[PDB]
Design a protein around this ligand. Structure first.
Ligand SMILES: O=C(NCCCC[C@H](NC(=O)c1cccc(O)c1O)C(=O)O)c1cccc(O)c1O
Ligand SMILES: [Fe+3]
Length: 697
C-alpha cells in the first residue's frame, strides 16, 4: 500500500473510511498529499483540491482508468490562481472504485503535462468471468444542522454476454447539502462600510448524477477492444460564496439554488493487445465539459461575484480530445530489462463567452486589444513522444531512465528527462532515489492576450492606481526538477519508511509584478491604467518529508500511520508562500479484525499549524487579523463494518468524534470594508454520524 513516492488506496480502504461524497477525502490522507487551494489568496477557500508535495492542485493530474480528466480547465482561472471549481475527484462514485493510485514526484514526470506534483489515477471495478453487481447506500448525519448532510446511492452490474464479449455499467445519485448561508456568522472577519453585513460562506452543496457504460470485446485470443461512454452532471447548491466575500442582491436571491452546473460527457475507445514481443495499448477519449453558470464580473471586487447588470446563465464549453499509443518490449540484452515506447496527442478547445468580456472604458484602451466582442475561442495542442527503459541491474535493483518530449503548438518544445532508482540494500530494506524535470503547459487563460482583468488599484502590485492584467502568449511552460531520496524497511507487515523530497520550481506562472505598459484614456483618476501580464517567476521551491509506519500489533490488529511534513514553500522572487498547507499531517488508523465477520476502525488525523501569506496584492506587509494563524488540531473517528453474509454488509461510524470545528472567516487579506481572515479560510465539519449498506453478488 505504501512505498517511497507511491501509494495505493484499495476498495477495502474506501469501505473502512467512507467519504461523504468526493474522493479527495480519502485521497488526501496519503503521505505527501494535502487538500488545499492553488495559491495563497484564500479565495474560493472551501473549494480545496488535492495537492501533491505542496506543488498546488493544478499540478496534480487526475486520471480515470488511465485517461485524463480536464474538466476543471473549463472554469475561469482568476487573478490569484484559483478557479471556482470543486476539482475533478468527484466524477466517479466512491463505491464503484476498485483502486486509487497516487504517484508523486520524479516517478510521475513521465505522465507529462500537469504532473509536476504527481498523478492520481482512479480505477474502476471491472467485470469478471461471471456476472456480478452491487447496490450501495451511504447517508450521514451532522450533529450541527447548519452543516450539510450527504446521501449517496450507487449501483454496479458487470458480466459476459458472449464468450469474448463483456460489459460493465454503474450509476450514481448523490446529494451533499450546502452549509447554511449563515454558518460562519459570529466567525467572520470584521466588516464595515459598504461591506458591513457580508458573510464568508460555508461549503457549497453538490448534486451528482453519474452513469457509465463499458463494452469490452475480445476479438482474438490476444486482442481486446473496449468502448465506453460516460454521462455525469454536478449542479451546486449555492450558499453565498463569492471570490472576495462581498455581496449584492443577486447573491442573496440565489441562496439555495443552482448557480453552476457542470455536465461532463466522455466517450472512449481502447484497444489493448497481448502478443509475443510484449504488449500494446492505445485509446481515443473525447471529453466534453459544459460549464453553465451565472455570469460573474471580472474587475476588482467584482471579480467572481454574480453580475446583476448582465444576469442569467452563460455556458463555457471544453472539448478535450485525447489519443495515446504505447508498446512494451522485454529485452534480454545481458540485463533483463523492459522497454516502453509511446506517442500522445491531445487537443483542448475552449469556448468561453463571459471570461473575455472585460472592457477598457474605465482604465483606457490597450493597443492590440479590442474592448468589445473579443473572441470566445482558445485552444492548444500538445504532441508527445516518450520511451522508458526499466532496467534490472541485479536482483533487487532497477534503474529506470526515460525521456519525454512534448511539442506545444504555441509554447514550443519541451524536454522532460527522468531517472528512477530502487535498491535492495537488504531483503528488508530498500533505498529509492529519483530526479526528473516535470512539465506544466500554461492554461488557456494564462496564455490568452484576449483575457483581461481590471482593478481600480486595490489589486495592483506595487501601486494604488488602476491596472489591467492580461494573458500572454509569449509565456514559457513551468518546469520543475523534482528530486526525492527515500528509505524503507519492510518485512512481515512491519513497514517503516521516510522520504525527503525537493522540487525546484522554474517559471511558475503567476500574475505579474511590474507594468509592461500603460493604457490610454478612460475615466478620471482611473484613466491610463497600468498593464501587467501573466509572467513566469524565475525560481520557487518546495521541500519536505513523507513518512509511513505500519506495526502489526497482533494477528487481528494493525496500526498504520502516514506522515507529511512540509519544510518549505517559497516563491523565491517575492518570498511569500506558494500554497498554504499544514506544517505536518499525521493520519493514524487502528484496524481490528474483531471477528471473521466484524471489523472495527479507529482513526486520528493531526494537523499542524497553518500560516497565511505575508504580503497583500500590493506587495505590502499585511496587518491585524490578516496574520491570524490556525493552531494545530486533531480529528478522530470510529467506524465499523458488520458483514451479515457474502451478499450483505452494513457500515456505521462517527467522523470527528470530539467535534473539533472550524469556520471560514474570509480571505487571507484585508480589502476596503473586509478585514482579512489569514489562514482561517475553510470550514471544518463537526461530528457526523454515518450509516451504510452494501448488497452484492
Ligand atoms: O474585494 C475587493 N474590494 C472590496 C470590494 C469592492 C466591491 C465593489 N468593487 C467594484 O465595484 C469595483 C469596480 C471596478 C473596479 C474595482 O477595482 C472595483 O472594486 C465596490 O466598489 O464596492 C477587491 C479585491 C481585489 C481587487 C480589487 O480591486 C478589489 O476592489
Ligand atoms: Fe477594486
Amino acid at each position: 500500500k505504501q512505498a517511497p513516492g507511491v501509494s495505493i488506496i484499495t476498495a477495502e480502504d474506501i469501505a473502512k473510511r467512507p467519504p461523504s461524497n468526493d474522493l479527495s477525502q480519502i485521497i488526501r490522507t496519503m503521505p505527501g498529499v494535502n487538500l488545499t487551494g492553488n495559491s495563497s489568496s484564500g479565495q474560493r477557500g472551501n473549494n480545496r483540491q488535492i495537492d501533491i508535495r505542496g506543488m498546488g492542485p493544478e499540478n496534480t493530474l487526475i486520471l480515470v482508468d488511465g485517461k485524463p480528466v480536464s474538466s476543471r480547465n473549463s472554469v475561469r482561472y482568476g487573478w490569484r490562481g484559483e478557479r471556482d471549481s470543486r476539482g475533478d475527484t468527484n466524477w466517479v462514485p466512491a463505491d464503484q472504485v476498485e483502486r486509487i493510485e497516487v504517484i508523486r514526484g520524479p516517478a510521475a514526470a513521465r505522465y507529462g503535462n500537469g504532473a509536476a506534483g504527481g498523478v492520481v489515477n482512479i480505477i474502476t471495478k471491472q467485470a469478471g468471468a461471471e456476472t456480478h453487481g452491487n447496490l450501495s447506500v451511504y447517508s450521514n448525519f451532522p450533529q450541527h444542522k447548519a452543516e450539510g448532510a450527504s446521501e449517496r446511492m450507487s449501483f454496479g452490474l458487470n458480466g459476459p454476454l458472449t464468450e469474448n464479449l463483456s460489459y460493465r455499467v454503474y450509476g450514481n445519485i448523490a446529494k451533499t447539502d450546502s452549509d447554511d448561508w449563515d454558518i460562519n456568522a459570529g466567525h467572520e472577519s470584521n466588516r464595515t462600510g459598504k461591506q458591513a453585513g457580508t458573510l464568508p460562506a460555508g461549503r457549497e452543496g453538490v448534486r451528482n448524477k453519474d452513469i457509465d457504460g463499458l463494452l469490452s470485446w475480445r476479438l482474438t485470443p490476444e486482442q481486446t477492444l473496449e468502448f465506453e461512454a460516460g454521462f455525469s452532471r454536478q449542479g451546486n447548491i449555492y450558499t453565498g460564496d463569492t471570490q472576495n466575500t462581498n455581496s449584492n442582491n443577486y447573491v442573496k436571491q440565489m441562496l439555495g439554488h443552482e448557480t453552476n452546473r457542470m455536465y461532463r460527457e466522455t466517450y472512449s475507445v481502447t484497444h489493448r493487445g497481448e502478443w509475443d514481443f510484449g504488449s500494446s495499448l492505445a485509446y481515443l477519449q473525447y471529453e466534453k465539459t459544459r460549464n453553465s453558470r451565472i455570469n460573474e464580473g471580472l474587475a476588482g471586487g467584482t471579480e467572481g461575484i454574480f453580475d446583476p447588470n448582465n444576469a442569467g446563465f452563460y455556458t463555457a464549453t471544453l472539448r478535450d480530445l485525447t489519443a495515446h499509443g504505447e508498446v512494451n518490449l522485454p529485452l534480454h540484452l545481458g540485463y533483463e530489462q523492459t522497454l516502453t515506447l509511446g506517442s500522445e496527442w491531445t487537443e483542448q478547445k475552449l469556448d468561453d463567452p463571459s471570461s473575455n468580456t472585460q472592457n477598457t472604458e474605465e482604465g483606457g484602451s490597450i493597443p492590440g486589444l479590442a474592448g468589445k466582442n473579443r473572441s470566445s475561442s482558445s485552444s492548444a495542442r500538445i504532441f508527445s513522444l516518450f520511451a522508458e527503459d526499466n532496467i534490472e541491474l541485479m536482483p533487487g535493483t532497477m534503474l529506470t531512465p526515460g525521456l519525454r518530449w512534448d511539442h506545444h503548438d504555441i509554447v514550443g518544445d519541451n524536454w522532460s528527462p527522468s531517472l528512477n532508482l530502487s535498491h535492495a540494500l537488504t531483503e528488508r530494506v530498500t533505498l529509492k532515489a529519483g530526479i526528473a524535470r516535470a512539465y506544466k503547459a500554461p492554461n488557456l487563460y494564462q496564455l490568452n492576450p484576449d483575457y483581461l482583468l481590471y482593478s481600480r488599484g486595490q489589486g495592483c502590485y506595487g501601486q494604488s492606481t488602476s491596472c489591467y492584467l492580461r494573458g500572454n502568449d509569449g509565456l514559457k511552460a513551468e518546469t520543475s526538477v523534482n528530486k526525492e531520496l527515500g528509505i524503507e524497511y519492510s518485512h512481515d507487515g512491519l513497514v517503516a519508511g521516510l522520504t525527503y523530497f525537493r522540487n525546484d520550481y522554474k517559471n511558475k506562472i503567476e500574475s505579474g509584478l511590474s507594468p509592461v505598459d500603460h493604457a490610454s484614456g478612460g475615466k478620471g483618476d482611473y484613466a491610463n491604467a497600468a498593464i501587467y501580464q501573466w509572467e513566469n517567476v524565475p525560481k520557487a521551491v518546495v521541500e519536505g518529508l513523507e513518512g509511513t509506519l505500519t506495526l502489526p500489533l497482533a494477528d487481528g490488529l494493525k496500526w498504520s500511520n502516514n506522515l507529511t511534513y512540509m519544510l518549505q514553500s517559497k516563491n523565491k522572487e517575492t518570498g511569500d508562500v506558494l500554497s498554504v498547507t499544514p506544517r505536518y499531517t499525521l493520519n493514524s488508523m487502528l484496524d481490528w479484525q474483531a471477528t471473521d465477520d466484524l471489523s472495527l476502525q479507529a482513526t486520528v488525523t493531526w494537523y499542524g499549524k497553518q500560516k497565511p501569506k505575508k504580503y497583500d496584492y500590493h506587495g505590502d506587509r499585511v496587518t491585524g487579523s490578516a496574520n491570524d494563524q490556525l493552531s494545530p488540531y486533531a480529528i478522530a473517528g470510529l467506524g465499523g463494518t458488520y458483514r451479515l453474509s457474502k451478499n450483505l454488509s452494513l457500515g456505521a461510524g462517527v467522523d470527528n468524534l470530539f467535534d473539533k470545528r472550524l469556520f471560514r472567516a474570509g480571505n487571507a487579506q484585508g480589502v476596503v470594508g473586509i478585514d482579512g481572515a489569514g489562514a482561517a479560510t475553510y470550514n471544518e465539519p463537526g461530528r457526523t454520524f454515518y450509516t451504510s449498506l452494501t448488497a452484492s453478488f
